[PDB]
Design a protein around this ligand. Structure first.
Ligand SMILES: C=CCc1cc(-c2ccccc2)ccc1OCCCNC(C)C
Length: 284
């Protein structure tokens, strides 16, 4: 192993630890593409955890300044201030591929603002959050996963990111509530007559199920839009992206099978991921 290989292997560890779903699928990409995904994912994962390192924006600003150094001087040596292995790997990617740096800055801004979290008044605010934490990641991945990106490639990547974040929200209602976060909008909670604290205490009811299903239908439509437009991605990436999206959206059926529980994190076991691989691999 070279020094650079060590950097990418660490990024891989971070991605696989955090997401068995995305690692299962994206590890099937050709070597140079999977390595880029690992680095981008690891940066975004580090951003996600950054406030809790000390309890304030310190580490997140260190990350931001490292990304800014790469943007301004991609071919210069940097004393990185944050996670040196991740930033060395990101820099290596930036030397080979176009990175949408503003999308990282939008992600960072979203994480900063989340310090001051207030419940979303409207679904538009919820979807804006989904853009900030997940559509941004799709934008950064777009040049890795396409040959000739257009406005459509970025639209489709944003839309997939938003589907994936909505699925995360739908899986994690109980855990997020424990952590003082409710992502369903106040407007929709009022319309469906749902109080998450009350549901956390007393279990699901038809009102809650109807609200959950309202959002699930959006995630599913987002997913179908992306599958319909999958030809924006490179031929090698298409079945991998279909696999990632199908594995992740299978979580919705797992939630349903578990009666929409607020008290455990449901999952798609490895053997089921493999079944989806076989179904998609046979298709391609
Ligand atoms: C690698 C998976 C992550 C990923 C992938 C696509 C995508 C977009 C287009 C095509 C293929 C994939 C979009 C958003 C993604 O990030 C979701 C939030 C992750 N947050 C953790 C990092 C905290």
């Amino acid at each position: 192993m070279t020094m650079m290989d060590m950097n990418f292997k660490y990024c891989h560890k971070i991605m696989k630890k955090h997401s068995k779903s995305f690692s299962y699928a994206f590890d099937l990409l050709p070597e140079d593409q999977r390595k880029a995904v690992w680095a981008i994912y690891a940066v975004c994962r580090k951003i996600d955890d950054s406030i809790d390192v000390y309890g304030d924006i310190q580490f997140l600003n260190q990350i931001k300044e490292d990304i800014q150094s790469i943007e301004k001087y991609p071919y210069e040596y940097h004393h990185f201030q944050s996670d040196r292995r991740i930033m060395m790997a990101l820099q290596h990617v930036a030397q080979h591929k176009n990175i949408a740096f503003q999308s990282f800055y939008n992600l960072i801004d979203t994480v900063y603002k989340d310090q001051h979290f207030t419940m979303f008044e409207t679904d538009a605010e919820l979807f804006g959050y989904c853009y900030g934490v997940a559509g941004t990641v799709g934008e950064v991945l777009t040049p890795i996963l396409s040959d000739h990106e257009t406005h459509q490639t970025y639209d489709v990547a944003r839309r997939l990111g938003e589907s994936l974040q909505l699925i995360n929200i739908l899986r994690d209602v109980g855990e997020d509530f424990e952590n003082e976060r409710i992502y369903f909008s106040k407007q929709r909670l009022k319309q469906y007559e749902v109080d998450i604290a009350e549901v956390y205490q007393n279990g699901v009811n038809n009102h809650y199920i109807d609200l959950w299903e309202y959002y699930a239908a959006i995630a599913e439509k987002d997913f179908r839009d992306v599958m319909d437009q999958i030809k924006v991605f490179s031929i090698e990436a298409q079945p991998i992206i279909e696999l990632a999206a199908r594995i992740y959206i299978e979580i919705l059926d797992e939630v349903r099978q578990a009666n929409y529980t607020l008290h455990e994190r449901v999952f798609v076991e490895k053997r089921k991921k493999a079944k989806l691989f076989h179904e998609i691999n046979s298709k391609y």
